[PDB]
Amino acid sequence: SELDQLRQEAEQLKNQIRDARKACADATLSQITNNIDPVGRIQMRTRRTLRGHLAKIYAMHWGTDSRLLVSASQDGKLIIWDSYTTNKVHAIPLRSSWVMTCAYAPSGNYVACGGLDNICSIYNLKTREGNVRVSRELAGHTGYLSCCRFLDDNQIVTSSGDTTCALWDIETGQQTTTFTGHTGDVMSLSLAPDTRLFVSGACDASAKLWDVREGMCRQTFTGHESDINAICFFPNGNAFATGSDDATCRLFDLRADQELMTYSHDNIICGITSVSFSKSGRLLLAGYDDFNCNVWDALKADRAGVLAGHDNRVSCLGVTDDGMAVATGSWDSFLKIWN
Amino acid sequence: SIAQARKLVEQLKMEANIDRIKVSKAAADLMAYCEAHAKEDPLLTPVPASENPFREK
Amino acid sequence: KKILLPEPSIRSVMQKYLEDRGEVTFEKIFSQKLGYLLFRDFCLNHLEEARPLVEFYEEIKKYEKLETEEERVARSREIFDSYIMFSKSATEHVQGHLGKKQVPPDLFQPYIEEICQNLRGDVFQKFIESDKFTRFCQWKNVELNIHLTMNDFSVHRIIGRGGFGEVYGCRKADTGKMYAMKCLDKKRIKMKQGETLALNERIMLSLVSTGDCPFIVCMSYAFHTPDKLSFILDLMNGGDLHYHLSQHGVFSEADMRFYAAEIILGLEHMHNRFVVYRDLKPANILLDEHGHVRISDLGLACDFSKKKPHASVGTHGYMAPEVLQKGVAYDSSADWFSLGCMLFKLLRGHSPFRQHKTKDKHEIDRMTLTMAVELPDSFSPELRSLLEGLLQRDVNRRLGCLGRGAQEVKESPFFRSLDWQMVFLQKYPPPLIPPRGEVNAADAFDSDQELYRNFPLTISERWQQEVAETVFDTINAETDRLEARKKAKNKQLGHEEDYALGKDCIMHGYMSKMGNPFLTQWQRRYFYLFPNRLEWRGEGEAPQSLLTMEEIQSVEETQIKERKCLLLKIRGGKQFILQCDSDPELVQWKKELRDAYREAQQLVQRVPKMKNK
Ligand SMILES: O=C(NCc1ccccn1)c1cc([C@@H]2CCNC[C@H]2COc2ccc3c(c2)OCO3)ccc1F
Ligand SMILES: [Mg+2]
């Protein structure tokens, strides 16, 4: 028939992929790094307890000045904080209460966000008035917006629960390009440093990779037993990490095109909600549902420490562009800055 | 679902035709970047209270 | 005492409360006294295009009450040649009447439906948006939270006395309106075994009490207490016709004509709402203090809209044949026979069938069943036709039982002189003005608590006219300054109150929480309900505290002393107890919290990032 040929010709390809994957699997990262020195016992202390949000925090993000951060809550707001002062530069009450994600434009000018509203909304902070306005309301998706990221002030990229991602012209306000492939809800996305490529991670238990200007997927990555809640680029634009519901994190490589490491423990039973790399790549920080955040050695996969401040679930996190700090938001309603 | 499989074969065709380096090498480029930029990574290298915006001022 | 309108933030909750019931339409708001007024205020002033149309509607409305033909002949021509005078065959219906020199009240009634058709849409959308609609919501909240006690009335003089209780005269404190109060005794009712009668009266009163009928003792409210039941009725301080007959002796034909004319329309009213009065007798007719009358004591009356009654209830003098016989059902027919017995007694001093001042109940019934109408020759021709008409033992022939009801009685030669528009208008002079200071003007001859559980009641049309006549325009002014001061206070300070606007707010407004679980200490706050959370703020700020839909496990009612509370059991097993300011806010918060917490927990389950596992 025509169906069975084009479903087995897929396995023939998936095998040809899985063979070329194993061909490249000469050693484990764990072996390659077995000898290099332990990071030590990384004990970070809570430095800023940022109170303000009134119920669960769900997402946050840092500006390019390495100081101003935007965050999103169950309480229905964006708070553009200044992490140094612990003070709020903008509180932007939102048109929709179900906010899940938020972003910050590289220029410092615009921010964006969304959630169960199925909209990515752009906010201009350079009005003549001297306040915040909504320049564009980018509509076109059909499921919950779960992540978004500006490339420049004319253009932006978005991921959603409808199982798609997309690039927008903000001037005309239309999707310049659209990105399909995924089969369960998309949860997170990460741009590259050059911003010609980006990556998505989903409840399908897989992650994917796209050329911005062509308009099509290049590479797809699996391994986890359960939902991938989080994704982040390795600093050089050639690998990325993941957080998952199966009680483990994982690293994947773009040119090698496969899984390098798994971060886990017999004591640890709960799931993972967020991942960020330190500026170099060496620490992988992850947030859990036993109320702690664990610092993993990215290369050795040892439990390097416990950020054990929060009294409920850790939900989001981020590392600065200058590497100075790690922010953790929780279900207990507080952000914390650590270093 | 005539197009659904025809897309998947076209797509996997794309995902196969890419020049793939290897895990020992990739692991070493990751390690090469880590080691290289490790100086300027505050979370590994305990930078003193002066250098840290979140310690004193 | 006086009525305190809640603040114009009540709009949010009440707009929803009434939208839940279907009541924010041109029809349901225009139809309400307090609604029409606010609508008109808007069109004449705060919209230019609407000016001509409402002016026309008002010039039409004024026109309908004009009493003589001459007035209508002039005001037809003035309305036709006026600056206002959009339609095609509206003009032709009126040009036909004008050409044939005719001018009824409903002359311009075709323009009523069509002016209403131009006032829905653009114009009514502009009203709902206007400040005038806000004010509507403020009044409607007061309505739905009425709980009365003895203490809400000023109880004056005893103006009635029966075997189960006593009637008292009174004023209602908050509007100053004057009223009567009937007060039945439960211990007595137990020994004398009359629990049904008490309960029956309550139902019947509520059937007749709308349409503002000049000719029945209507109810505005009902309530009860550990020993007493109580009704609040139209004030009739003038005594019953059993006392008055026994004072005045019998009445003239023309005097009885007045009483007849009014009672007839009183009956027209009960009959157009399918009630059989049953117990018509002098002791149940009652006079105001101009001497206009109303019917009363509905305890033996009956809804005949469904099943027509068969029991022999009434009083042995005044029962119709069909009532006295078991196995025979009856409708409003009983009233027209009773009217004859009662009108004949007004003219003669005893029931036609209570011959020879006998107590032999058995004899009295067989005279009602068998013998016929011994009418004196003194009675006029037009009167003789009437009582023969009313006292037919066979319903087929009884006047007002042939098809067109009360108008069969109105067209009688006996009422030929009357302009029945002038009658309904109370514009004809009454025959007996009752004297000031009269004792015994309405006397008669002489576990369990569960039965009266649901007794309390209130009538909207009555409470609304009560207000409109009285305190309305002055309260609206008092409130409009109070509001406009605080909007100047918000504008000049540079601080608008718009935390609800431009978001996804469901409903906001005040309630009171207990936040000291050992202590019992209550605190009032402004709540914003959003789809996922119940935020709350205090005085002059954005909200600092909340409760999530997620965390709520059940929403019950609990009693603490005499506080009706909402008991949210929260995860932990902790108890969050809330107290609303009014019944409708308790109903809406209990509804919207249940509906929000179930809707939230259902949706939160469908979102991986938000659920727990
Ligand atoms: O006992 C009374 N009525 C009979 C009854 C009622 C309920 C249940 C069982 N039985 C009763 C009767 C009267 C009088 C007895 C004589 N006829 C008039 C009647 C009603 O009196 C009124 C007197 C003044 C009124 C009024 C009614 O309405 C407005 O102002 C007064 C109080 C009474 F409690
Ligand atoms: Mg009968």
Instruction: Please give the method by which this entry was determined.
Output: X-ray
A289 touches A246 (CB < 8 A): no
| DSSP code, position C581 | S
CA distance C581 to C594: 19
CA distance B18 to A219: 9
Which residues on chain B are in Cβ contact (under 8 Å) with A283? 41, 43-44
Q: Name residues whose C-beta falls within 8 Å of residue C284's C-beta, 6 or more positions apart in sequence.
A: C240, C295, C296, C297
Q: Which of C198, C195, C183, C190 is nearest to C230 (CA)?
A: C183
**How far is the first Cα of chain B from the last one, in angstroms, to the nearest whole number?**
63
Please give the distance, rounded to the nearest whole angstrom, from the Cα atom of residue A219 to the centre of ligand 2.
92
Q: Residue A238 and residue B29: Cβ atoms within 8 Å?
A: yes
CA distance C509 to A145: 31
**Separation in Å, CA B43 to CA A235, A293, B39:** 15, 15, 10
Distance from CA of A207 to the nearest CA of C (A): 17
Residue with structure tokens 């098809």?
C403
Residue nearest to atom 17 of ligand 1 (CA): C283
CATH number at residue B35: 4.10.260.10
DSSP states of A11-48? HHHHHHHHHHHHHT-SS-HHHHTSSSPP-------EEE
Structure tokens at C236: 């009739």
Query: Quick check: helix, strand or coil at residue C414?
Result: helix
CA angle A290, A43, A293 (to 5 degrees): 20
Is the C-alpha dihedral spanning B26, B32, B37, B43 positive or negative? positive
Minimum CA–CA partner of A51 in chain C = C544
* C310 burial type by CB count under 10 A (0-12 exposed, 13-18 middle, 19+ buried): middle
**Separation in Å, CA A208 to CA A22, A115, A221, A295:** 19, 21, 6, 25
Find the largest Cα–Cα distance for chain C.
97
CA distance C367 to C355: 9
**Separation in Å, CA A219 to CA A238, A258, B18:** 12, 10, 9
Q: Residue C311 CA: which ligand is closest?
A: 2
Distance from CA of C548 to the nearest CA of A (A): 8
| Strands annotated E in C263-371 | 275-276, 285-287, 293-295, 302-303
**How far is the first Cα of chain A from the last one, in angstroms, to the nearest whole number?**
61
C and A touching (3 or more beta-carbon pairs closer than 8 Å): yes
Sheet of C219-224, strand order: C153-161, C165-172, C178-185, C228-233, C219-224, C457-458
Query: In angstroms, what is the C-alpha Rg of chain C?
Result: 30
Range of the domain at A35: 1-339
Residue with structure tokens 């084009």?
A6
CA angle C55, C60, C66 (to 5 degrees): 125
Is the C-alpha dihedral spanning C576, C581, C583, C589 positive or negative? negative
CA distance B5 to A333: 46
Find the largest Cα–Cα distance for chain A.
67
Q: Residue C327 CA: which ligand is closest?
A: 2
CA distance A190 to A207: 11
Q: Tell me the Ramachandran region of residue A209: left when phi exceeds 0, alpha when psi lies from -120 to 50, beta otherwise.
A: beta
Please give the distance, rounded to the nearest whole angstrom, from the Cα atom of residue C326 to the centre of ligand 2.
4
**Separation in Å, CA C88 to CA C91, C111, C415:** 6, 11, 41
Please give the distance, rounded to the nearest whole angstrom, from the Cα atom of residue C297 to the centre of ligand 1.
6
Residue with structure tokens 């006998």?
C358
Is the C-alpha dihedral spanning C250, C252, C253, C254 positive or negative? negative
Q: Which of C224, C195, C221 is nearest to C206 (CA)?
A: C221
For testing the chain B interface, which of A280, A297, A319 should be mutated: the one with the most B CBs within 10 Å?
A280
Residue nearest to atom 30 of ligand 1 (CA): C236
CA distance A218 to A208: 8
User: What is the total count of domains within chain A?
Assistant: 1
Minimum CA–CA partner of C536 in chain A = A54
Structure tokens at C280: 């018509």
C211 touches C168 (CB < 8 A): no
Range of the domain at B21: 1-57
Please give the distance, rounded to the nearest whole angstrom, from the Cα atom of residue C442 to the centre of ligand 1.
8
A157 touches A148 (CB < 8 A): yes
* C228 burial type by CB count under 10 A (0-12 exposed, 13-18 middle, 19+ buried): middle
* C530 burial type by CB count under 10 A (0-12 exposed, 13-18 middle, 19+ buried): buried
Which residues on chain B are in Cβ contact (under 8 Å) with A255? 19-21, 26
Q: Which of C382, C380, C317, C311 is nearest to C350 (CA)?
A: C317
Distance from CA of C501 to the nearest CA of A (A): 9
Q: How many CB atoms are closer than 10 A to CB C462?
A: 19
CA distance A92 to C502: 11
Query: In angstroms, what is the C-alpha Rg of chain A?
Result: 20
| DSSP code, position C106 | G
Q: Residue C184 CA: which ligand is closest?
A: 1
- Resolution in angstrom units: 2.6
Q: Which stretches within C311-447 are classed as H helix?
A: 321-324, 333-348, 361-369, 381-390, 406-410, 420-424
Q: Which of C518, C519, C569, C508 is nearest to C543 (CA)?
A: C508
CA distance C329 to C497: 65
Phi then psi dihedrals of residue C12, to 5 deg = -55, -55
Q: Measured between CB atoms, which of A216, A239, A279 is closest to B14?
A: A216
CA distance C82 to C89: 18
Q: Measured between CB atoms, which of A58, A76, A289 is closest to C530?
A: A76
List the catalytic residue out of C41, C234, C240, C279: C279
CA angle A305, A311, A316 (to 5 degrees): 65
CA distance C567 to C580: 12
Residue C279 bears catalytic tag: yes
Phi then psi dihedrals of residue A229, to 5 deg = -80, -20
Q: Residue C532 and residue A97: Cβ atoms within 8 Å?
A: yes
CATH number at residue A31: 2.130.10.10
Beta strands C545-548 and C275-276, pairing class: unpaired
A121 touches A112 (CB < 8 A): yes
To test the pocket of ligand 1, the residue of C153, C156, C166, C167 to mutate (highest count of ligand atoms within 8 Å of its CB) is: C167
Q: Which of A14, A9, A8, A108 is nearest to A61 (CA)?
A: A108
C55 touches C44 (CB < 8 A): yes
Find the largest Cα–Cα distance for chain B.
65
Residue with structure tokens 């409607």?
C140
Query: Quick check: helix, strand or coil at residue A161?
Result: coil
CA distance C369 to C360: 15
CA distance A124 to A90: 12
**Separation in Å, CA C337 to CA C206, C411, C541:** 24, 18, 71
Distance from CA of A12 to the nearest CA of C (A): 33
**Separation in Å, CA C404 to CA A163, B17, C138, C400, C407:** 72, 95, 43, 7, 6
* C22: Cα within 13 Å, side-chain hemisphere: 1
Distance from CA of A235 to the nearest CA of B (A): 9
**Separation in Å, CA A239 to CA A197, A250, A302, C460:** 12, 11, 20, 72
For testing the chain A interface, which of C541, C547, C609 should be mutated: the one with the most A CBs within 10 Å?
C609
Q: Residue A55 and residue C548: Cβ atoms within 8 Å?
A: yes
Q: Name residues whose C-beta falls within 8 Å of residue C291's C-beta, 6 or more positions apart in sequence.
A: C238, C430, C431, C432, C433, C434
Q: Residue A203 and residue C535: Cβ atoms within 8 Å?
A: no
Annotated binding site of C for ATP: 159-167, 182
Is the C-alpha dihedral spanning C246, C249, C252, C255 positive or negative? negative
Q: Which stretches within C289-396 are classed as H helix?
A: 321-324, 333-348, 361-369, 381-390
Q: How far is CA C457 from the centre of its chain?
A: 10
Beta-bridge partners for A90: A80
**Separation in Å, CA C555 to CA C479, C512, C549, C566, C587:** 35, 16, 11, 7, 12
What are the contacts of A14-19 at 24+ separation with CB within 8 A?
A14/B12, A16/B16, A17/B12, A17/B15, A17/B16
Q: How many CB atoms are closer than 10 A to CB A146?
A: 30
Minimum CA–CA partner of A4 in chain B = B5
Q: Residue A97 and residue C531: Cβ atoms within 8 Å?
A: yes
Q: Residue B24 and residue A26: Cβ atoms within 8 Å?
A: yes
B and A touching (3 or more beta-carbon pairs closer than 8 Å): yes
Phi then psi dihedrals of residue C285, to 5 deg = -95, 150
B12 touches A17 (CB < 8 A): yes
CA distance A196 to A254: 14
Is the C-alpha dihedral spanning A111, A117, A119, A121 positive or negative? negative
Helices C131-143 and C33-45: crossing angle, nearest 10°? 170
Torsion, Cα C77 C83 C88 C89, to 10 degrees, reads -30
Domains (range + CATH), chain C:
7-49+121-147+459-499 (1.10.287.1270), 50-120 (1.10.167.10), 148-237+442-458 (3.30.200.20), 238-441 (1.10.510.10), 500-606 (2.30.29.30)
Residue with structure tokens 């107290």?
C579
| DSSP code, position C502 | T
Minimum CA–CA partner of B35 in chain A = A280
User: What is the total count of domains within chain B?
Assistant: 1
Query: In angstroms, what is the C-alpha Rg of chain B?
Result: 23
CA distance C281 to C297: 10
Please give the distance, rounded to the nearest whole angstrom, from the Cα atom of residue C202 to the centre of ligand 1.
13
Structure tokens at C290: 């101009």
DSSP states of A65-122? TSSEEEEEETTSEEEEEETTTTEEEEEEE-S-S-EEEEEE-TTSSEEEEEETT--EEE
Query: Quick check: helix, strand or coil at residue C87?
Result: coil
* Atom in ligand 1 nearest the alpha carbon of residue C183: 34
Q: Residue B12 and residue A13: Cβ atoms within 8 Å?
A: yes
Q: Residue C503 and residue A95: Cβ atoms within 8 Å?
A: yes
